[PDB]
């Protein structure tokens, strides 16, 4: 029997585990230490959650090690590993409303969006990678023959072993799911560190692995701090790969920590300052809808959010007027209410950061067209914000806000290479977008953009089959698609002479 | 007009460039600094070689950056890039006797072996990767459709950009070629740091890039120290990928440096303590021939060399007797002499390490059956060495010798899992081998060995098409094969709505 | 409501549709023509089944064409097509005992075997191919650029369209499932002709597609004759691909019919005379167990059954002794008796062929060691049979029996190429096998065997992920594995200039 | 020494073999039978060429069989096979002017075009496929494990063996090269039947295989008739695959013949009636140039030639005007004259068909704007032709001309699905094209077009890396690209238990 925090909300009863998940059981942290998780809608404490200590990390890694080396997970057919992950996705679907509601409470996710994206895409992710298990294939290779003898050379794709996954707070279940589904499908075992501020869906997911019959120790979850828990995962001699999503500065530190311990493999999904280039020959009303979406989706807490919009001179003013018209129609409120389409920011410190970010924008000479402030109501709501007259040297032209802040610059009519240059003048390179009806411009622009994803006449169109990853200081390695598996597999070459 | 060090040897007139190669020209280092490269056959100075400074690294990177962004290399068809690399291989083949002679002088590589392997495989490498250029392909992906609209998702494989390659001294031209061929085939430009002690074939290769018509700046080569030149490559803000082959300790430092600068991509080919398991049911005389080769090939200066031989109890004594018989037949001598089987070690400091290594093996109680000493003659020759009665706790059971030292332990008749455990009890995992006529043993052992390559009834059978790389602290990423290309490519996802 | 033949049997009340399945409806054939399906355990009529006429084929093709061109199946996401095929597999699993009982009744499949193989593998097949739907990918190709312009070349994998599937009677549901799963996973629609003698699991399967929510017209099933129904499918101007499994002679006719109509695509899975080579260095008792299985599995009604065993001279006589001992232990009987090892042959005409086949083997000089005749009892049971002293020129050395008839020839101790020659001297090429503990023999023999599958130290080890298909007159194209999809997809090259 | 027909022409001395090429030597046919090859520029006899008989086919097939089974080609490394094919391409390049001149004489190919395309692309083809030799790889597959035991499943890609290649006369050397390069790269040997009317570049190519060191019997070439030589190839019991390019009706007969003999594999590249849809929003002047090329390239003797142009109402008249202006500037003349851009048709019988085709076009009511007639001069020249007012029911809207006849229909402004229906209302499906600046329209049209290739804002843009093949009655299988290899390879599955 598991201890839950119980809550009647959104026409259901939430049953939320709040403890560490180690070796298939929910347990207190060392010293029974706890911390509070905070509801961003009203600022209240949802509940106390166990605070993992170093010895808890070591227990989790040891359970993952044992599950990998001696447990059933390392012994079953790849097909049967697939079946378990497809069952896990089924169980998640059976609990979809509950997961989405927990995500609304914990992260401020608008419930209707959480159901479709945070949760819906997580379910798709497990089903997708479950199908990869018995389709992961090595090669046979026509090497030169040591005559008069013969040679056969094959490769075997094997699991990397014990993995550590460290994730951010913006889509807690979804980021967990993207990386965990690939990690498990490849036959690995894992210790997961959710962001300290958003532990709840991770711990509920942990319970769901029990319902799905995932063997004990295959999945371990440690709410706790990056500087303590995340650090120990990166340092651990028995961890063989870290999958990381978060800030560029933390990613640098993780990669360093991987190097200094045992050269564990690492993948990094880092920040973004993604440019969206909107040409005069686009469909304007549709550009407004998708442009707003590119920024405001999930209250801007989205690594691929367009952090910079370049709008062609002749449509700029009309674009801005229409955006302001639409912004005014947005319903800001409780993420659980059906009319809400803009929820609170994830946590208080992040709201403060956004208020300061916009002050700096104003101070440096950008035009604040609307928003810029906290919404005067309980919780941590921030106004959808539009800046114009943004110049390339400005702080807000360079820094990732990670909030609902549209940052608009003009470019001259007929210019193409000039705007590309400005769009590429960043050490980030996660995503980018272009709106145009012109086939030649679209294809040329997608070639020239220095970003791991280019959207054409859409934005935020991620898919579980489409690889997602950055260039330059946005990191390396892919989440999603077949390519994600390569971060969680090793290749063994076997060469016979006969 | 290029300055050469001319030398009449091996019935040839060598013409050896000795300067830095930057932007298609041979130039002195800053302040005309130089150092001596030493011939290991007699300890003499071959010539002075330019000693690259930080400002020279910056010039080479600048030249690589310009060549990639604006030069011809970034504009030609993939097919035509391939043509140029196939031409480069042809030029290398036209110069193969000269290259192999230079390698004999610089590295002590036995000339007949240098023709076939050091140079022969280098030529194969460029030809192989030249064939990949117009066969590197992305994907089109059946993503969910944003109804009532449609979506197309494709990926493009793009070059990573400016790369740094840092290599060791054991097969100077060949290690350069493995990495450089894959790097260029993927459309990158490069700055190469050969091992300071072995710059000569790299500088002659540089001249061959001119003869093949490789555009200026595509290939830059900087003889010099890792702590200065290599370090600056790892730190440089314009370098986007480092490809590294060398020790585990330098590998850690390189990876950390990649992290702290701009999270440039890194791949690591590190040390090895590769086990070879020889069962009583093997072909014994064959096991002797290949067992000796597994250790003594290229005077043991071979990252995948078997660093432990485990020999089944019932054949152990006969195996050792037969090895000693064959060892006595090996002809030690000048690498340029046709009857030479065993050349000198690469440089003096390494010879010193090997002497100390074997002193320690004797101190700790292993049976020295033969060799262990510097051969009494000029240069840095080391006697082929056999140790028996090696126990798992011993230093020589754990430490990589990187020399011609066969390190033998017994295992009990029938003890498969037990010998496997001992073979895997290392933080290395580069290679491994098994000799047995029994199909079931061979397949089971190859599954269980924790190494990037498993040889079965053979050893040292590498091939330009078969990926080569380690697990655990032997690093990550592959050289050779299609898999090598993945280190030198990035994936851009392009998603349309229409 | 659907009309059923109801039968209380095996603790179940079977509900068996008996009509044609066209456009989601069970309907009588033209003129309400019917035929009898016969129970092989007692020779009784199970029920009457609709007998499809030409106009019925045309209706089925029209329904498939409409389903493909305008129906939901052609509009849903690949992922959602995947979900439907998974759900179909789930429905089949929910009905597995019923399906296995129907197969026991209709084909004489031993119930315990039918559960695990006939039905169990069918379920695995749909689950496997369901996972491929959203992982079918095209390419982006680095073509030469039409300078000063640019080119993008991609491929799209598309369905072929309306398919016809014609299958035999040996594993009715399983052969249906192999082909249909790959067909549907690739996005096609289909008309299936089950063998006339075995229509019942196909018709129950049809009903399961309704329960699973497969759109109307996606699957159509027409019990009836090859010469009428199968012929019209091969001739039809709107059918674009035929997938065929059956005899070599009908395969020739089918391929010819494809040519003469509209050059529709064709894949052919035809006869076998598969050689099993058993060396003296094998595990003998295991060779007896697997050698028996290689012949007797599914009462020999198995296209890959070993049609000749070559047994090395020195073990031949002991091998035969052990086989005879084991053959005597086989329990022949009603497929529903849980201890039955050997069920009846599929239908009466096949039993008669087997009696004649054995009369001919004795006539031409082979030694009948055991079996060779009908078992005296109701139904169509044939004795597990062993022939020795079989020589290469003999009819039974050349002709496929498709029955439980072990056909043994000696080969000389220590010859390998000579036995390989004899094993390869056939125009069939579907499967083959080798038993040996010697790795060198096993690898060499597997290279040299001219057959689409080579088993090593096993037999009949098919897998839904492992491609299955013949060489020479055993046909071409694969069922199962990723390779199977290629028969059901077309490649569209799309080339832009911009 | 080889007998040549010598000819001084185009500032060269041509040396043309004229005999059968069998087992590495030029030999007379049975009975020394010969026939004349005709120069289409003036109708004169170029020379006499050996006329292969049935016994000659049997000799060629026996030579191919021996070369495959026992010769060097079956033994060498895939890498060394690649080297020979690369060397073959170099020899072709060394002879490119001579080959282009021979093709000018034999096929009427304009010399400048012959050099760039007929010959230039043939060289690219051999170099491209040479690169595939050591990159053709099978798989290792994670099948279910027969516990308590283990399984390993791998695939081996093997050659199909002896192949027959039968080709048309439109690009004699190029069609030879497309198929032969893929065939040889996959390790097969071959018997080639050039079109009887165009044997000369094939025979010269045969000589070049000798210069390149291709082992005897690997390439065999038999000038002769399809009804005799081609038929025997399709019938032969030792031929295992036919690669065919030609008419749909001969394709059907070839496939039938493959079926009736030994179910040899077959690929078919058949006719085309390829639609080109030109929207009003395209670049009109570029549409005229590329529209011109789509029809008139290689005097229309081009399987993928646009056989219908659909031009949007509002630009139709202006398009026709501009086309007529450009047609008038075409210089008709001797293919060896540098100012010629429209050469003669390939042979007299084809000229006759083109005359009859346009007579019928006029009879049935289409508007003949220009041409339609044999040019008054010696040889077989045909006036570039433009028809307008072409209606869907008309013979010339349905039947492939394979000549320089532009066939134009209107479609209403803003119609998309309507013109697609009309473009798709054909049993052909080889190529197609769309000109538009609208990205949404271009992508939608490319989805909907029922053809193996879709060109967007270009035409005739083939590439050796881009697969080329038809749908429906245009055949199946690809030439060019990775995909082409699959027609010349078989997959062997090898499954171990251990
Ligand atoms: N590229 C993508 O796929 C993607 C997706 C989502 C977010 N992001 C990026 O993430 C950033 C926003 O999240 P954030 O600012 O909260 O990121 P962050 O500070 O880098 O935190 C990410 C995770 O790393 C942990 N961490 C901190 N120090 C660590 C250490 N020394 N060792 C191991 N782990 C450590 C954090 O723990 P704590 O809980 O203690 O903070 C957290 O769980 C943005 O820049 C955004 O673009 C990127």
User: DSSP string spanning A200-266?
Assistant: HHHHHHHHHHHHTTPPTTSEEE--S-IIIIIHHHHH-TT--EEEEES-HHHHHHHHHHHHHHH--EE
How far CA B299 is from CA of B243, B342, B464, C305, in Å, comes to 25, 6, 22, 53
State the Cα–Cα distance between residues B324 and B292, nearest whole angstrom.
10
Q: Give kind and range of the element (H or E) at residue A36.
A: strand A34-38
Q: Which two tokens stand for residue C415?
A: 């010859």
Identical fold for domains C6-271+464-498 and C272-463, yes or no, is no
Say if A136 is an interface residue toward chain D (CB within 8 Å).
yes
Please name the residue ranges forming H helices in A70-143: 78-94, 96-107, 111-113, 120-132
| Other beta carbons within 10 Å of A313 | 13
Region of D389 please: left (phi>0), alpha (psi -120 to 50) or beta. Answer: left
State the closest ligand 1 atom to the C-alpha of A303, by its place in the atom list counted from 1: 47
CATH 2.40.50.140 fits B6-271+464-498, yes or no: no
State the Cα–Cα distance between residues D413 and D419, nearest whole angstrom.
10
| Other beta carbons within 10 Å of B277 | 25
Q: Per this entry, what is the length of chain A?
A: 498
Whether residue C239 contacts residue C61, with contact meaning beta carbons closer than 8 Å, is answered with yes
Domains of chain B, residue spans:
6-271+464-498, 272-463
Residue of A nearest to B496 (CA): A456
Residue linked to tokens 């859409």: A458
Q: Three-state secondary structure along C297-345? A: HHHHCCCCCEEEEEEEHHHHHHHHHHHHHHHHCCCECCCCCCCCCECCC
Breaks following residues of chain B (C-to-N distance > 2.5 Å): none
C69 three-class SS:
helix
Closest by Cα among D296, D295, D278 to D287: D278
Whether residues B493 and A461 touch (CB distance < 8 A) is answered with: no
State the Cα–Cα distance between residues C369 and D343, nearest whole angstrom.
77
* Residues facing A278 on adjacent strands: A311, A435
Breaks following residues of chain D (C-to-N distance > 2.5 Å): none
How buried is residue D349: exposed, middle or buried, by Cβ count under 10 Å (0-12/13-18/19+)?
exposed
Rounded to 5 degrees, what are φ and ψ at B402?
A: 60, 30
Quick one: resolution in A? 2.1
* Residues facing C433 on adjacent strands: C276, C455
Residue C282 neighbours by CB under 8 Å, 6+ apart:
C315, C435, C436, C437, C457
Question: Number of CB pairs < 8 Å for B and C?
Answer: 70
Q: Which two tokens stand for residue A82?
A: 């697939």
Q: Is the dihedral of CA A244, A245, A248, A250 positive or negative?
A: negative
How far CA C231 is from CA of C36, C225, C349, D256, in Å, comes to 21, 9, 22, 15
Quote the distance between the C-alpha of residue B36 and its chain's center.
23
C45-50/C34-38 β-pairing = antiparallel
- Greatest C-alpha distance within chain A: 84
Distance between Cα A270 and ligand 1 center (Å)? 8
Q: Using a CB-CB distance cutoff of 8 angstroms, which residues of chain D are in contact with residue C452?
A: 490-493
| Other beta carbons within 10 Å of D12 | 13
Torsion of CA D306, D312, D318, D319, to 10 degrees: -10
Sheet holding D475-476, edge to edge: D25-27, D20-22, D219-221, D189-193, D162-166, D241-245, D265-269, D475-476
Q: Kindly provide the b/e burial profile for residues A23-54, where b requires at least 16 CB atoms within 10 angstroms of the residue's own CB.
A: bbebeebbeeebbebbbbbeeeebbebbbbbe
Q: Which two tokens stand for residue B99?
A: 């290259």
State the Cα–Cα distance between residues A311 and A280, nearest whole angstrom.
8
State the closest ligand 1 atom to the C-alpha of A246, by its place in the atom list counted from 1: 10
Rounded to 5 degrees, what are φ and ψ at A192?
A: -105, 130
Whether residue B434 contacts residue B277, with contact meaning beta carbons closer than 8 Å, is answered with yes
| Other beta carbons within 10 Å of C115 | 18
Cis preceding linkage at B124, omega within 30: no
Distance between Cα A487 and ligand 1 center (Å)? 19
* Residues facing B96 on adjacent strands: none
Q: How far apart are the first and last CA of chain A?
A: 58
C420 three-class SS:
helix
A190 three-class SS:
strand
Closest by Cα among D319, D320, D371 to D342: D371
Residue linked to tokens 């969206």: A276
How far CA D76 is from CA of B432, C375, D186, D187, in Å, comes to 28, 55, 12, 10
Distance between Cα A249 and ligand 1 center (Å)? 9
How buried is residue B398: exposed, middle or buried, by Cβ count under 10 Å (0-12/13-18/19+)?
middle
Please name the residue ranges forming H helices in C158-230: 172-185, 200-211
Torsion of CA A114, A118, A123, A126, to 10 degrees: -170
Please name the residue ranges forming H helices in A364-413: 395-398
Q: Per this entry, what is the length of chain C?
A: 498
Q: What single DSSP character describes residue A148?
A: T
Closest by Cα among D79, D185, D119 to D480: D185
Q: Is the CB of A164 under 6 A from ligand 1?
A: no
Distance between Cα A162 and ligand 1 center (Å)? 21
Q: Which two tokens stand for residue A224?
A: 């706790």
Nearest to C498 among A127, A439, A496 (CB): A439
Rounded to 5 degrees, what are φ and ψ at A392?
A: -55, -30
Breaks following residues of chain A (C-to-N distance > 2.5 Å): none
Q: Which two tokens stand for residue A491?
A: 């290749």
Q: Three-state secondary structure along chain B? A: CCCCEEEEECCEEEEECCCEEECCEEECCHHHCEEEEECCCCCCEEEEEECCCHHHHHHHHHHHHHHHHCCHHHCCCHHHHHHHHHHHHHHHHHCHHHHHHHHHHHHCCCHHHHHHHHHHHHHHHHHHHHHHHHHCCEEEECCCCCCCCCEEEEEEEEECCEEEEECCCCCHHHHHHHHHHHHHHCCCEEEEECCCCCCHHHHHHHHHHHHCCCCCCCEEECCCCHHHHHHHHHHCCCCCEEEEECCHHHHHHHHHHHHHHHCCEEEEECCCCEEEEECCCCCHHHHHHHHHHHHHHHHHCCCCCEEEEEEEHHHHHHHHHHHHHHHCCCCECCCCCCCCCECCCCCHHHHHHHHHHHHHHHHCCCEEEECCCECCCCCCCECCEEEECCCCCCHHHHCCCCCCEEEEEEECCCCHHHHHHHHHCCCCCCCCEEECCEHHHHHHHHHHCCCCEEEECCCCCCCCCCCECCCHHHEECCECHHHHHHHHEEEEEEEEEC
Region of C367 please: left (phi>0), alpha (psi -120 to 50) or beta. Answer: beta
Closest by Cα among B110, B400, B463 to B270: B400
The alpha-carbon radius of gyration of chain B (Å, integer) is: 24
Q: Which two tokens stand for residue C319?
A: 């091998």
Closest by Cα among D26, D27, D29 to D52: D29
Work out the minimum CA distance from C126 to partner chain A, whole angstroms: 12
Residue of C nearest to D154 (CA): C466
The alpha-carbon radius of gyration of chain C (Å, integer) is: 24
Angle between helices B96-107 and B172-185 (to 10 degrees): 130
Whether residues A135 and C465 touch (CB distance < 8 A) is answered with: yes
Whether residue D134 contacts residue B128, with contact meaning beta carbons closer than 8 Å, is answered with yes
| Other beta carbons within 10 Å of A69 | 12
Residue B363 neighbours by CB under 8 Å, 6+ apart:
none
Number of H helices, E strands in chain A: 15, 22
Whether residues C270 and D260 touch (CB distance < 8 A) is answered with: no
Q: Which two tokens stand for residue B94?
A: 């036209």
CA D65-D71-D73 angle, to 5 degrees, is 95
Whether residues B152 and D498 touch (CB distance < 8 A) is answered with: no
Q: Give kind and range of the element (H or E) at residue C65.
A: helix C54-69
Selected from 3.40.309.10, 2.40.50.100, 3.30.70.890, 3.20.20.150, the CATH number assigned to the domain covering D272-463 reads: 3.40.309.10
Question: Number of CB pairs < 8 Å for A and C?
Answer: 55
| Other beta carbons within 10 Å of C484 | 29
State the Cα–Cα distance between residues A385 and A292, nearest whole angstrom.
10
D306-312/D241-245 β-pairing = unpaired
State the Cα–Cα distance between residues B401 and B355, nearest whole angstrom.
10
C453-456/A241-245 β-pairing = unpaired
Q: Kindly provide the b/e burial profile for residues C445-467, where b requires at least 16 CB atoms within 10 angstroms of the residue's own CB.
A: bbbbbbbbbbbbbbbbbbbbbbb
Whether residues C465 and A132 touch (CB distance < 8 A) is answered with: no
Residue linked to tokens 């790097």: B183
Rounded to 5 degrees, what are φ and ψ at B457?
A: 60, 30
Whether residue A207 contacts residue A177, with contact meaning beta carbons closer than 8 Å, is answered with no
How far CA B171 is from CA of A385, B113, B174, in Å, comes to 60, 11, 5
Q: Per this entry, what is the length of chain D?
A: 498
Residue linked to tokens 């020839």: C409
* Residues facing D140 on adjacent strands: A138, D154
Solved using: X-ray
B25-27/A306-312 β-pairing = unpaired
Torsion of CA D137, D143, D146, D150, to 10 degrees: 50
Residue A36 neighbours by CB under 8 Å, 6+ apart:
A45, A46, A47, A48, A49
State the Cα–Cα distance between residues D398 and D360, nearest whole angstrom.
12
Q: Kindly provide the b/e burial profile for residues B475-495, where b requires at least 16 CB atoms within 10 angstroms of the residue's own CB.
A: bbbbbbbbbbbbbbbbbbbbb
State the Cα–Cα distance between residues B393 and A434, nearest whole angstrom.
62
Whether residue D268 contacts residue D254, with contact meaning beta carbons closer than 8 Å, is answered with yes
Say if B440 is an interface residue toward chain C (CB within 8 Å).
yes
State the Cα–Cα distance between residues A373 and A381, nearest whole angstrom.
9
Whether residue D40 contacts residue D346, with contact meaning beta carbons closer than 8 Å, is answered with yes
State the Cα–Cα distance between residues B452 and B464, nearest whole angstrom.
15
How buried is residue A147: exposed, middle or buried, by Cβ count under 10 Å (0-12/13-18/19+)?
exposed
Whether residue B167 contacts residue B176, with contact meaning beta carbons closer than 8 Å, is answered with yes
């Amino acid at each position: 029997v598991i201890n839950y925090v119980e809550k009647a909300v959104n026409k259901l009863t939430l049953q939320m585990p709040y403890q560490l998940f180690i070796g298939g059981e929910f347990v207190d942290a060392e010293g029974s230490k706890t911390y509070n998780t905070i509801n961003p809608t009203d600022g209240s404490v949802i509940c106390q959650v166990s605070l993992a200590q170093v010895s808890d990390v070591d227990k989790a890694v040891a359970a993952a090690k044992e599950a990998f080396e001696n447990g059933l997970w390392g012994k079953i057919n790849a097909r049967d590993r697939g079946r378990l992950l497809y069952r896990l996705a089924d169980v998640m679907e059976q609990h979809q409303e509950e997961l989405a509601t927990i995500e609304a409470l914990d992260a401020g996710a608008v419930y209707t969006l959480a159901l479709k994206t945070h949760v819906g895409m997580s379910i798709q992710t497990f089903r997708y990678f479950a199908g990869w298990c018995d389709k992961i294939q090595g090669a046979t290779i026509p090497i030169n023959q040591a005559r008069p003898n013969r040679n056969l050379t094959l490769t075997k794709k094997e699991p990397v072993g014990v993995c550590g996954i460290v994730i951010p707070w913006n889509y807690p279940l979804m980021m967990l799911s993207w990386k965990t589904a690939a990690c498990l499908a490849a036959g690995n075992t894992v210790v997961i560190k959710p962001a300290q501020v958003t532990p709840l869906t991770a711990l509920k997911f942990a319970e769901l692995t029990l319902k799905a019959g995932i063997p004990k120790g295959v999945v371990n979850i440690l709410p706790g701090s990056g500087s303590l828990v995340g650090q120990r995962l990166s340092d651990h001699p028995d961890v063989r790969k870290i999958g990381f999503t978060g800030s560029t500065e933390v990613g640098k530190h993780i990669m360093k920590s991987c190097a200094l311990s045992n050269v564990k493999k690492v993948s990094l999904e880092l920040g973004g300052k993604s440019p969206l280039i909107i040409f005069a020959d686009c469909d304007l009303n549709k550009a407004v809808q998708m442009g707003m979406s590119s920024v405001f989706f999930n209250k801007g807490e989205n690594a691929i959010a367009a952090g910079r919009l370049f709008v062609e001179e002749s449509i700029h003013n009309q674009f801005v007027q229409k955006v302001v018209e639409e912004v005014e129609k947005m319903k800001i409120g409780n993420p659980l209410e059906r009319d809400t389409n803009h929820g609170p920011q994830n946590h208080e410190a992040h709201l403060r950061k956004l208020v300061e970010y916009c002050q700096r924008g104003v101070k440096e000479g950008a035009t604040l067209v609307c928003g810029g402030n906290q919404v005067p109501r309980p919780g941590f709501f921030f106004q959808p914000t539009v800046f114009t007259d943004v110049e390339d040297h400005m702080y807000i032209a360079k820094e990732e806000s990670f909030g609902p802040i549209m940052i608009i610059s003009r470019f001259a009519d007929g210019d193409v290479d000039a705007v590309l240059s400005r769009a590429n003048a960043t050490e980030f390179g996660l995503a980018s977008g272009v709106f145009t009806r012109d086939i030649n411009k679209a294809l040329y622009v997608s070639d020239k953009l220095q970003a791991g994803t280019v959207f054409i006449n859409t934005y935020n169109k991620t898919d579980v089959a489409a690889p997602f990853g950055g260039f330059k200081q946005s990191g390396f390695g892919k989440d999603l698609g077949e390519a994600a598996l390569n971060e969680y597999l090793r290749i063994k070459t076997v060469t016979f002479e006969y």
